């Protein structure tokens, strides 16, 4: 699934301050998007143990 809407996150008077797997080939298929996601959780859990 891809983003479809552009919300008004920021408004006026706001405060300031080929040979590799591309995000396209990750997007077209979900089974490879969830396998990379499941790697991110492993990295987070590893960093929790220092």
Give the nearest distance from C-beta 29 to its own copies in angstroms: 10
With CB under 8 A as the rule, give the number of residues binding its own copies.
31
- d(Cα 45, Cα 39) in Å, to the nearest integer? 10
The answer to whether residue 49 forms part of the interface with its own copies (CB under 8 A) is yes
Number of CB atoms found within 10 A of residue 26's CB: 13
The answer to whether residue 15 forms part of the interface with its own copies (CB under 8 A) is yes
Burial of 33 (C-beta count, 10 Å sphere; 0-12/13-18/19+): middle
By the criterion CB under 8 A, which residues form the site for its own copies? Answer: 1-17, 30, 33-34, 37-38, 40-42, 44-49
């Amino acid at each position: 699934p891809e983003n479809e809407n552009k919300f008004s996150l920021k408004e006026a008077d706001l405060k300031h301050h080929e040979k590799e797997v591309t995000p396209k080939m990750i997007n077209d298929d979900i089974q490879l998007k969830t396998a990379i996601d499941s790697l991110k959780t492993w990295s987070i859990v590893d960093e929790k143990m220092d």
